[PDB]
Design a binder for this molecule. Structure first.
Ligand SMILES: CCCCCCCC/C=C\CCCCCCCC(=O)O
Ligand SMILES: CCCCCCCC/C=C\CCCCCCCC(=O)O
Ligand SMILES: [K+]
Ligand SMILES: [K+]
Lengths: 583, 583
């Protein structure tokens, strides 16, 4: 009621009037991740809140044994809120240009695509690569899922809605690895993904729809925002651990009253009035991460960190604040936990990568174009090499490779141990084996020619845990006066979590609602409602067959189609179907 | 091939790289209407062409007996190209705001809607006002038209595709008068309108979808653009009549070589190279306009002016440059020709208007909210009163009313003459009669208390003449190197003419194509392909009935619906249909 959804250029280009009474308001942002930063940016730009009244509370202060590549997930053109934000953030690389400009021009200069998406048998390209290999049964299961109401998917697993045909498809290889879905994850979220990205189905196998920043996410997204916020006087408070927020939850209002913090070791409290807004990033996929090195595994852990402890403390004050235990408890021990960043200047390794991905990793352009999946790896390992180098101060003869394994409790094929028990050099050895490197060189090249840093992340799969409506708090809970939840464990319609777009969307919706900003929020792109996109999807999903080939081997369908074509012959519907290759 | 269509914020907010070799190029814009001005703006902003190399050639120089209101057509939110343009044009009314900002804020401060759309019997509101009164037969004719391929509508009249039920509907009253469609006009263009604006069907009767500038179009749109262009050094050349452009049309290229002009009376020629771009606004609805006064009719005329003569001279050089005679010849003598602007400070007239439209005309906010149609007027007359005053220097106790008649060859009900034979005061008398003013006061109030300026426009209905594909030139004809056609007689996909959006779209497409600008053009809004919008349309078109009421009185349908509901029961399709009130 305190916001509305829109689309089109009118609302995109319009500027909101200064919101009412904002001169008497303040904001506290809990956490320093992308959602907090984006919310602060919207407070400055569209709330016209004074930067000095904006307080970002970060647990970290103002030494790892090598380079580590973080989230690094791709974006797409229809990250509608994220581009609304980053058109206003100055680039740190190009004069008089925004982050969006630099990104837009870069991905036109050097457009992303994969020349080798799946390998097997120690370095062979998969033979059916490029094809979805979906049977009619699997396709009907996909569409049956989209045709299920989200409300009917409470706690439903991906394995509850798909059968053997689907799980044997190339589609499932592409899908599970690029998005990091496990079979026991949320069918509700998988449905959101299917609908959310249907306009890019023709780019699923070759990653032609992916777009990437010039450098790692921190240098290309976080640092530009931080510079923008600091230039506007926003206050960054470091070594602040937020332990609880006392919230009054009455029959008529929800009002945050006090932030209980541990500053640099000392218990303190921030008293809030109704004009002091609090933005909580509830939960975190990176909390309690541990780090290994070339010779040491990352020590597994089950610690609840400060992020999960805080959400638990808020949930104790109202069921409307969500159910953190659905996301941070009972995570299967087979789940993805470990990622590794393997850095080398060794020509044997780099030349091996070149022979598989067909591009020079040191040229400074696209290399793998996104992850390469090792389809027959016991770990279900994938790895990617982005445009090199991904760190501004890294030597120009080095590459850094990011590696992850979807299965954490199964022996590797060359290193006969679960990934959670492997040092950096052992992870690199298993990877080199699957590249086809000669087995008499693997040990030396991993131990002495590379430096590999593993990271153990207990909650990295947490976004996708099976959930019920109500497990995630509304961005602005009902009757909340000065409290919002942002980030990928907050609830909003149809958008997909594990994306930076979701972080920016929740940030924008929280700020606009709490300040009653008179401007539209862009809806999640309308592609699942667009007949043209749905026609393309049928054509692509059936691996480029028209309606006659699709129905050929079924009399019942073969006849319903002939009756359909009779009615639409010579009409606009027939020309549309022909334009989208269905006729 | 030299442009691409896009939608969403990514392409909206992105800035194009400077196009290649633009530093060696020039532009000549023929005419000073909105399309020429918009093209010049895009040349500056996105072509990064130097303003000194941009030459606008206007026939007019750098005295009417009263105020005259011109085009004054409304806009809507999904004028996608127009808002792309006017976000970059500084407002002349508000500091540090664009034209878009001022427009956006104004129409939120004072949103448009009609409190009385149709009157009859000398000032009575129409009883069924607000309802479409469409029969099932008429609705199927509407959808059958949309389901016809545009290519099958060559030279087809509106009367060729609709029957008595449709022409007796309130829908047709609303539609024909707000858009100025005549029964003999283009069914192809009517189809484009139905598809183009389907997202606003719920605002058709009460004009809630309409948005208006603060002042008349010249003060609120043209003058801001002119100031922008002059501030960038763009050259305005006045008293230049362009008589012909010599174009080389070879087997491989189309190249404009020479502009033949009459400057201030003297024959001259502008020599063009391939790097000199020429933008022709072919044809004009305002050419050869004549003016009357309170005591004199506007003299009818059939003169081809300079605009139509120029298009004819170009068409003689290639059929690819269009067929002007389809639009400027054989216009029926019943067509709309006359509009009048009636200005008064008289309290009897203003109070009469207040009693019909329910708002104070002098308050400075919406008055009629768009045209009021006099349904039983022999002339088929409508009139509107915008926010007053529409001219910045007009006295604050005056209103100006705009009046037009769809039928030009039929005696009025009070003044027993065709409108083409009427003085300004006689047009005002016929109007006052239909307002219900007492017949013993009409003559005095028209002659002495009002000043009414009639305008005769031979080509005002020209955009809508029946046409065939090929009658309008492509914005950039095939193989054209330096020549483009812009404005509402140029050809582009799915957009609707007689709109300022069409002028800006053709301008943008011409500039982007001729300069090969590397940025997307926003497509015509995708509403006819959006299932949600199509569901709303069925609900509104059937005057707010669900699928069971719609089908109730037909056994055949009543059964196909029961079979449909059986298949979709409990699915996402059913929830969608319920959300859009069809179930
Ligand atoms: C009713 C709707 C039917 C939906 C059909 C479902 C098919 C979805 C197809 C897969 C989308 C592939 C997405 C790959 C693009 C990369 C994602 C990204 O941009 O981040
Ligand atoms: C296949 C598509 C079916 C199309 C259904 C057609 C019904 C169209 C309904 C009328 C649209 C009314 C437009 C009124 C809004 C004002 C126009 C404007 O904004 O300038
Ligand atoms: K917006
Ligand atoms: K654009």
């Amino acid at each position: 009621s305190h916001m509305y959804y829109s689309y089109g250029n009118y609302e995109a280009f319009a500027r909101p009037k200064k919101p009412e009474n904002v001169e008497n308001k303040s904001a506290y942002l809990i956490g320093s991740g992308l959602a907090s930063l984006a919310a602060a940016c919207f407070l400055i730009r569209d709330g016209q809140m004074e930067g000095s009244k904006i307080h970002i509370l970060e647990e970290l202060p103002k030494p790892l044994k090598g380079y580590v590549v973080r989230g690094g997930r791709a974006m797409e053109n229809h990250f509608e809120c994220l581009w609304d934000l980053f058109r206003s953030i100055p680039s740190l690389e190009i004069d008089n240009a925004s982050v969006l400009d630099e990104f837009y021009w870069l991905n036109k200069e050097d457009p992303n695509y994969s020349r080798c998406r799946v390998i097997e048998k120690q370095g062979q390209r998969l033979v059916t690569d490029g094809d979805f290999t979906l049977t009619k049964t699997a396709i009907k299961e996909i569409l049956d899922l989209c045709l299920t109401n989200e409300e009917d998917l409470d706690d439903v697993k991906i394995t509850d809605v798909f059968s053997d045909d689907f799980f044997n498809s190339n589609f499932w290889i592409y899908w599970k690895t690029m998005f990091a879905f496990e079979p026991w994850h949320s069918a509700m979220e998988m449905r959101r993904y299917l609908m959310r990205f249907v306009h890019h189905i023709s780019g699923l196998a070759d990653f032609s729809a992916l777009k990437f920043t010039k450098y790692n996410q921190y240098e290309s997204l976080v640092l530009p925002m931080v510079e923008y916020l600091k230039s506007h006087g926003v206050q960054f408070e470091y070594d602040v651990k937020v332990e609880d927020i006392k919230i009054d939850v009455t029959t008529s209002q929800k009002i945050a009253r006090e932030i209980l913090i541990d500053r640099n070791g000392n218990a303190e409290s921030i008293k809030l009035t109704i004009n002091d807004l609090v933005f909580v990033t509830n939960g975190s996929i990176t909390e309690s991460s541990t780090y290994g090195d070339n010779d040491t595994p990352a020590p597994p852990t089950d610690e609840l960190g400060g992020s999960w402890t805080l959400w638990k403390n808020l949930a104790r004050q109202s069921p409307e604040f969500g159910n953190p235990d659905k996301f941070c408890q009972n995570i299967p021990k087979k789940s993805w936990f470990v990622s590794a960043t393997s850095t080398t200047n060794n020509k044997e390794i780099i030349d091996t990568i070149e022979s598989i991905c067909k591009r020079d990793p040191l040229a400074g352009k696209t290399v793998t174009g996104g992850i390469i999946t090792i389809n027959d790896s016991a770990w279900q390992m994938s790895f990617t090499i982005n445009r090199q180098q991904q760190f501004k101060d890294q030597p120009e003869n080095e590459i850094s490779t990011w590696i992850y394994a979807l299965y954490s409790d199964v022996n590797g094929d060359y290193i006969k141990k679960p990934i959670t028990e492997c040092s950096g050099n052992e992870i690199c050895q298993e990877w080199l084996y699957h590249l086809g490197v000669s087995t008499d060189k693997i040990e030396d090249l991993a131990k002495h020619a590379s430096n590999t840093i593993p990271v153990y992340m207990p909650y990295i799969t947490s976004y996708f845990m099976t959930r019920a409506i109500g497990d995630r708090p509304l961005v602005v809970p009902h009757q909340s006066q000065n409290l919002a939840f942002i980030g990928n464990f907050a609830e909003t319609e149809r958008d997909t979590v594990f994306t930076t777009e979701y972080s920016v969307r929740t940030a924008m919706e929280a700020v606009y609602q709490l300040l009653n900003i008179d401007r539209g929020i862009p809806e999640v792109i309308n592609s699942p409602f667009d007949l043209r996109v749905l026609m393309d999807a049928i054509y692509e999903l059936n691996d480029h067959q028209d309606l006659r080939e699709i129905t050929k081997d079924s009399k019942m369908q073969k006849l319903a189609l002939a009756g359909f074509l009779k009615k639409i012959k010579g009409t606009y519907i027939e020309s549309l179907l022909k334009e989208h290759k269905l006729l």
